[PDB]
Write a protein that binds this ligand. Sequence first.
Ligand SMILES: [Mg+2]
Ligand SMILES: [Mg+2]
Ligand SMILES: [Mg+2]
Ligand SMILES: [Mg+2]
Ligand SMILES: [Mg+2]
Ligand SMILES: [Mg+2]
Ligand SMILES: [Mg+2]
Ligand SMILES: [Mg+2]
Ligand SMILES: [Mg+2]
Ligand SMILES: [Mg+2]
Ligand SMILES: [Mg+2]
Ligand SMILES: [Mg+2]
Ligand SMILES: [Mg+2]
Ligand SMILES: [Mg+2]
Ligand SMILES: [Mg+2]
Ligand SMILES: [Mg+2]
Ligand SMILES: [Mg+2]
Ligand SMILES: [Mg+2]
Ligand SMILES: [Mg+2]
Ligand SMILES: [Mg+2]
Ligand SMILES: [Mg+2]
Ligand SMILES: [Mg+2]
Ligand SMILES: [Mg+2]
Ligand SMILES: [Mg+2]
Ligand SMILES: [Zn+2]
Lengths: 86, 122, 53, 202, 118, 50
Amino acid sequence: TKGTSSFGKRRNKTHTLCRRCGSKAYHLQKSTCGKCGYPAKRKRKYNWSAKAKRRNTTGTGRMRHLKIVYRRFRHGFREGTTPKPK
Amino acid sequence: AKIKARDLRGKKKEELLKQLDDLKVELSQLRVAKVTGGAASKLSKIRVVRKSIARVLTVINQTQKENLRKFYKGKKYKPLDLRPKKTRAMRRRLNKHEESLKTKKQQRKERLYPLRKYAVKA
Amino acid sequence: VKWPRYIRLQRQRAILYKRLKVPPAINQFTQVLDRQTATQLLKLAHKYRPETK
Amino acid sequence: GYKYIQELWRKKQSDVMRFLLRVRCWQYRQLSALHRAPRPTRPDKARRLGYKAKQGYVIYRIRVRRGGRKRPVPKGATYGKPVHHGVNQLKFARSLQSVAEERAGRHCGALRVLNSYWVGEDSTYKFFEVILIDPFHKAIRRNPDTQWITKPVHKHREMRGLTSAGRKSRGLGKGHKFHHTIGGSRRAAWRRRNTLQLHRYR
Amino acid sequence: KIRTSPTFRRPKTLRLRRQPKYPRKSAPRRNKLDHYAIIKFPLTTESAMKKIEDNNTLVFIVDVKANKHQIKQAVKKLYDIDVAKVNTLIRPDGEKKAYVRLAPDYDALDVANKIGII
Amino acid sequence: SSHKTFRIKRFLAKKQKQNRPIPQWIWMKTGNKIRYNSKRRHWRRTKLGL
RNA sequence: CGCGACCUCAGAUCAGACGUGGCGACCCGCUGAAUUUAAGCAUAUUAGUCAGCGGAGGAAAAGAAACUAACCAGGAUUCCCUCAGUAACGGCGAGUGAACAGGGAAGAGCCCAGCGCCGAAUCCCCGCCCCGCGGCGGGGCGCGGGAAAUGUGGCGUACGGA
RNA sequence: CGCCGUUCCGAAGGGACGGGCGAUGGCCUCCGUUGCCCUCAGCCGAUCGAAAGGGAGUCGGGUUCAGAUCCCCGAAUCCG
Ligand SMILES: [Mg+2]
Ligand SMILES: [Mg+2]
Ligand SMILES: [Mg+2]
Ligand SMILES: [Mg+2]
Ligand SMILES: [Mg+2]
Ligand SMILES: [Mg+2]
Ligand SMILES: [Mg+2]
Ligand SMILES: [Mg+2]
Ligand SMILES: [Mg+2]
Ligand SMILES: [Mg+2]
Ligand SMILES: [Mg+2]
Ligand SMILES: [Mg+2]
Ligand SMILES: [Mg+2]
Ligand SMILES: [Mg+2]
Ligand SMILES: [Mg+2]
Ligand SMILES: [Mg+2]
Ligand SMILES: [Mg+2]
Ligand SMILES: [Mg+2]
Ligand SMILES: [Mg+2]
Ligand SMILES: [Mg+2]
Ligand SMILES: [Mg+2]
Ligand SMILES: [Mg+2]
Ligand SMILES: [Mg+2]
Ligand SMILES: [Mg+2]
Ligand SMILES: [Zn+2]
């Protein structure tokens, strides 16, 4: 009865998609995420999981501002200039 | 007709917004042709008109930004958009004058004991 | 009245300055210049004020 | 003058200074735990520790509870060998003055801690005063005698143990007493002693 | 001025208004929910052609962020036709279908004849 | 259920539009290996997480 | 009663700034084990290590002796060879374990408070002029406002200095 | 890092009528606006917590291959 019988009672979910990390780990009762600790300011990460870091690091996403900073860097972040016109 | 960005810079703000308000109607008529079924000669003009709108709005924002930083060319406080945007640590430095500042004690040391140029005989 | 903390603090520090045995070195500041000598004093100390900006 | 307040603040066992330190400690015991002071309580000790009476210099007064560091564990039960059954009589390795300077350097994270000093204590509290500098004022930016504090290297001097009260806790120094901190720090000494140099040719 | 009540309440002081010395952003951001972006295309399905023919309505795939007010006031701009009512619904596809019912005198079938869908 | 939310109706819509076969014009390309769509999903077997 | 100071303390979508979070190989500050070794084990060892927390930089930290020495003396810090598996610690068991000198890479010094001297001789802010203007400055005006005598600037700091 | 704590060590109300002063837009008549005082004010704790608790107000008929107290027609109703 502890098995197949009590596997039907599973109907109300514990977690939902966190809004900061898009993972399905937001405990609806504790109101905090198990993947990023959303209500806490600091993203939670431990060294004892070397791989969960490599799944969430500065390369894993779009770097929509870093991949351009790495390009404006090769010229000391020049500003207010354009090439000489034709 | 190939809308180049060169012959768009002399026109006036409302002589640009009339072109915008005509290109958006040409878009609406092309997104209608797409759903009613239209010739590929028309369907392929969507990529041409979305980019004509892109060129127009680009020249509009460029003239507006040049006018803005000309109005604030010599002013002291200017919008954070016209302020030079570099890295946070590069914007939170000391000025080249704060770097090039010296106490009167070092303006007196550097003066009374300069670094002399010399050689030695071998 | 229930006063704010800073008011009650300074109002009962003026009381601690009446309950605590104040050494004569601090108590020698209560015996001060009178109200008649003060006038003539500042009268003389007005002809020798420093210069302004 | 300043040497008169100096030689006066060394007779803390006298009458006048045990009255003053006691009315000060009573008044401090009524305010908040971390509050800004209007002006330096000890102007002489503040000059000695680097306080120029000019804009940008700030003084925070802060109180800390005396006593050692009980180990944060369950009821008793520090699971380990009897060596580490100690919870009660343990001591903390950073002085209460460094803890005052870092509760100020954390409550107000924009300002840079310079030093701090003792302004009173009782059985359950120690009262310090932390000399915070505002590193983006122009009285500090332009004045070149003190524009070193405005560089990013001196962020959180007290979280990195570079203030006076902090440096006093890392056991560094030159001599035959300070051998275990030859090199950068205790861990940069430990690394070089516990590091096996394996040359190419052995 | 006697203290009539034993509760010292904080006195109300004066509060000024923001007189900035420089606007943060240089220019107001243009309204990206234009009258044109708010209406993408119509539908030509016999589920909406019976609405046009019988119910004298039209079926547009409007932007999802659009109110029935923005829709009404943007069909009265792109097509110059007074509107009876608007009924929106978000499809399982994701887009927001909108049934716009024209005034009694205006004929949907004859404004769809105009704009193209017929 | 039938008492969805907006974020969830929208996530189901995305999971509906990702559930279609590769366009037929796409394996005459040159640098091509995709024989078929392998990221497909059946509503019965795999249950979309959530 | 009122008026005006000063001190202490609040309120602002007050004018202008600043912090927050991420990364984390290396670095700085704390917290801190137990597997294992001892042919058991309890001190020791593993180890100030794994985990944990905080803070940075392109390096960090340290740094111009309250030093080493006992010589015919050396002279900031950091690094390598060597001292040295040494002196020493240790159920003196298991095991642990530096420094001085010397040869090299590099090489650089300084600054305050205080004590005195000077008419506060000093600093920040706003308004206007001209320039510079994409690292917000230079010069001139303002019986313009503040900070500061509960101490600003110049000389000056243990090698002595005035 | 944070934890404790929810009326407890708190200057915790940015509100209202009337009056006086001041300004504003127009049949500048007479209301409305916002600036300054005068008068008055309890509260009890920011905020969250129920598609079964509390919670104003829509019913008939027709219609689709799949939607109807939702669309069409006809009758109402609450709130501002
Ligand atoms: Mg539960
Ligand atoms: Mg240092
Ligand atoms: Mg000591
Ligand atoms: Mg403001
Ligand atoms: Mg064993
Ligand atoms: Mg064994
Ligand atoms: Mg065993
Ligand atoms: Mg042991
Ligand atoms: Mg050891
Ligand atoms: Mg320790
Ligand atoms: Mg670790
Ligand atoms: Mg952390
Ligand atoms: Mg950080
Ligand atoms: Mg950096
Ligand atoms: Mg350094
Ligand atoms: Mg020395
Ligand atoms: Mg040496
Ligand atoms: Mg040596
Ligand atoms: Mg050499
Ligand atoms: Mg000097
Ligand atoms: Mg001096
Ligand atoms: Mg709590
Ligand atoms: Mg609610
Ligand atoms: Mg209910
Ligand atoms: Zn999450």
